[PDB]
């Protein structure tokens, strides 16, 4: 046999895997990656998704667009080249963005954000809000995905200021960001 088996390095966060080797390699955007691919035979290691002939893969300041599935095709031609492969789930949470709209008296607050993983949206008014005559929802055209807070009929004292607390469950050391808008 001519073998291979991957182990992590660089900057992982809250590790989990399965029966063969590391299914997941979570990393934050801006950090450094290092994936070391072992051998038995010697063989010649091969990282790919031009076939890079580094034993250890490495990327400084890893971006969202660099994430994906990479394999390790180590070979001296002693039987079938062993191929162990791994997920690079690059993570982030942007500045969230907040538009609005008005009529008789209904007011919408639309809240987008690009994230990875998919973010969790929370709506406030000093303390957090969920279903009286006030609605929240997700839509079909989830270009974010997005979240919308609708005020059905402006009652005297739901005229205060609101916040769209987005969160990624603090995963991989990533802070919660939010956004405020006022009303009169």
């Amino acid at each position: 046999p001519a073998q291979a088996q991957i182990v992590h390095a660089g900057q992982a966060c809250v590790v989990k895997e399965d029966n063969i080797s590391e299914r997941v390699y979570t990393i934050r955007e801006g950090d450094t990656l290092m994936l070391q691919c072992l051998v038995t035979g010697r063989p010649q290691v091969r990282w790919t998704k031009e076939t890079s002939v580094f034993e250890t893969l490495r990327i400084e300041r890893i971006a969202r667009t660099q994430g994906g599935r990479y394999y390790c095709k180590a070979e001296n031609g002693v039987g079938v080249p062993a191929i162990k492969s791994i997920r690079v789930d690059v993570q982030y949470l942007d500045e969230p963005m907040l538009t609005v709209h008005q009529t008789v008296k209904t007011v919408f607050l639309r809240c987008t954000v690009n994230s990875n993983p998919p973010a969790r949206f929370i709506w406030k008014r000093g303390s957090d809000t969920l279903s009286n005559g006030v609605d929240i929802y997700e839509p079909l055209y989830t270009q974010g995905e997005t979240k919308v807070l609708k005020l059905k009929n402006l009652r005297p004292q739901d005229y205060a200021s609101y916040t769209c607390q987005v969160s990624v469950r603090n995963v991989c050391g990533i802070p919660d960001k939010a956004i405020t808008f006022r009303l009169t």
């Binding site: 399965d18 029966n19 063969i20 299914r23 998704k49 994906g68 599935r69 394999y71 095709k73 039987g79 079938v80 191929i83 492969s85 997920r87 079909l140």
Partner: protein
């Protein structure tokens, strides 16, 4: 090695029947990856048909999901698979002398069958194609039924053996094919029904690295209900149970099955769920790294020139349920069969009730509420849409969202003995109108029916040569030519440009998009 020669208008061709691609899975090489070919000491008798892999025809038979010719002409389909043996890892080739009516010719490998449990490459005489196309056509046998994909989900029995057989057979071509006037950098896999599914699964794998460039999924794909089995243990348990092998341990229960004779193992009968499969490929974490759909979404593959398509009314069989009735298809039976549609597919079923009646709605033609036919019609469509059409689009959508070049089609032609159904595209692809009615294709092949065979082959072959079907050999059928003033635009995510195959060929945009969307965009988002 050397073999035999044949001829029928066209340039003559050499066949290579009974060439092995790996040492056969016999002892404890059963439920083990294929190791490569045992070394050939003498000029191998590459002259007659290699026997079939372990399958049972006489009962356990996924009707709905099999091609029509298969289940219309079973007596005829039986004749090929009668010589069975466990030693079945043999491919065939078809290579021509001269160009039909020595620079390295491309390679079209055929995956096959219809279910994961039924077929051989022998049924498909890819000889005409080779001659008329001037390329090398390969028809194989992979391990079927239990032998192909039994799994525990452990290191004990990883599964996906049948694929690995296809992968190895492909690796045979890569290393060898050069020595038949073949080309290792223009190899082209192409499939139908399950083969299609398989085509799509190899693509997503790592193990098919330097082995092929071009892929053709004739009616089917990897994200459908019955392309992939996500419950391997449950059904292997039922198999192990009917032969007294179901031990509490994994590894011991596997080593049990080894000793039961192959004859005895496959012809056993386990029914799966409705619109599912019990023995088939699985997410192992090697040849299928993750759930196909998830792989396809995240872009965890590389850019293979794809050619997917789909036929008007695929699952005709679905409405062969109360076909012979003709007061139509019953009013309230429509409700019924849909209820079971939603349940065995989406039936989670906290908020199902909506899902049923709202999916009923989209397919009941409100022009004539009362006509049974214009439910039957629609029910065909319903099923058709969900179990091929839509999936196929969404796969394309992704493979072109990541910029593999890819072309799309719709097939619209029967040729009657007894609606263009699943499978009916094949004889046209394999040129069978040009030889006359074979045993499993009985049809009055019209002057037209030929034109169609030519045009599909010309397209399909060209595609292997370049990764552009409408380029190399341009469209001609004067040996009018109705496909002359038509160019097969590339598919993309936006204007879903596809080719209408048929007597009236052309480019159209967004196949059936209305329904496509219902299934792709609204419905899964209900729950």
């Amino acid at each position: 090695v050397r073999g035999v020669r044949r001829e029928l208008i066209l340039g003559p061709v050499v066949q290579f029947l009974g060439v092995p691609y790996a040492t056969p899975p016999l002892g404890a090489r059963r439920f083990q990856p294929p190791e490569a070919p045992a070394s050939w000491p003498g000029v191998r008798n590459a002259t007659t048909l290699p026997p079939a892999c372990p399958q049972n025809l006489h009962g356990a038979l996924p009707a709905i999901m099999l091609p029509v010719w298969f289940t219309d002409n079973l007596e005829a389909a039986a004749t090929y698979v009668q010589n069975q043996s466990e030693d079945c890892l043999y491919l065939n080739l078809y290579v021509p002398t001269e160009d039909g009516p020595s620079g390295k010719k491309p390679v079209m490998l055929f995956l096959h069958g219809g279910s994961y449990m039924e077929g051989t490459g022998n049924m498909f005489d890819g000889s005409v194609l080779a001659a008329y196309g001037n390329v090398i056509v390969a028809t194989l046998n992979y391990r079927l039924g239990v032998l192909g994909f039994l799994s525990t989900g452990d290191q004990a029995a990883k599964g996906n053996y049948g694929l690995l057989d296809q992968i190895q057979a492909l690796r045979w071509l890569s290393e060898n094919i050069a020595h038949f006037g073949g080309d290792p950098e223009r190899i082209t896999i192409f499939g139908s029904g399950a083969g299609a599914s398989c085509v799509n699964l190899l693509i997503l794998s790592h193990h098919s690295e330097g082995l092929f460039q071009k892929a053709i999924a004739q009616s089917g794909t990897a994200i459908s209900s019955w392309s992939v089995n996500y419950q391997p243990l449950k059904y292997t348990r039922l198999l192990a149970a009917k032969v007294g092998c179901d031990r509490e341990d994994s590894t011991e229960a596997v080593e049990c099955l080894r000793r039961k004779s192959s004859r005895e193992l496959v012809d056993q009968d386990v029914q799966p769920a409705r619109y599912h499969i019990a023995f088939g490929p699985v997410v192992d974490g090697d040849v299928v790294p993750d759930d196909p759909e998830i792989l396809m979404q995240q872009g965890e593959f590389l850019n293979y020139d794809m050619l997917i398509g789909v036929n008007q009314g695929e699952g005709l069989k679905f409405v062969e349920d109360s076909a012979e009735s003709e007061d139509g298809v019953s009013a309230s039976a429509f409700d019924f069969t849909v209820s079971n549609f939603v349940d065995n597919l989406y039936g989670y079923p906290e908020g199902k009730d909506v899902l049923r009646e709202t999916i009923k709605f989209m397919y009941t033609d409100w022009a004539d509420r009362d006509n049974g036919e214009m439910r039957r019609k629609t029910l065909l469509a319903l099923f058709t849409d969900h179990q091929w059409v839509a999936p196929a689009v969404a796969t394309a959508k992704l493979h072109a969202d990541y910029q593999s070049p890819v072309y799309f089609y719709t097939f619209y032609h029967h040729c009657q003995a007894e609606d263009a159904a699943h499978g009916d595209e094949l004889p046209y692809v394999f040129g069978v109108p040009m030889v006359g009615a074979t045993d499993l294709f009985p049809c009055n092949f019209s002057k037209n029916d030929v034109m169609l065979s030519a045009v599909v082959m010309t397209y399909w072959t060209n595609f292997a040569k370049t990764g552009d079907p409408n380029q190399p050999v341009p469209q001609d059928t004067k040996f009018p030519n109705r496909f002359e003033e038509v160019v097969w635009s590339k598919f993309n995510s936006k204007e879903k440009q596809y080719l209408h195959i048929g007597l009236k060929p052309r480019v159209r945009d967004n196949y059936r998009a209305n329904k496509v969307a219902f299934w792709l965009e609204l419905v899964p988002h209900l729950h």
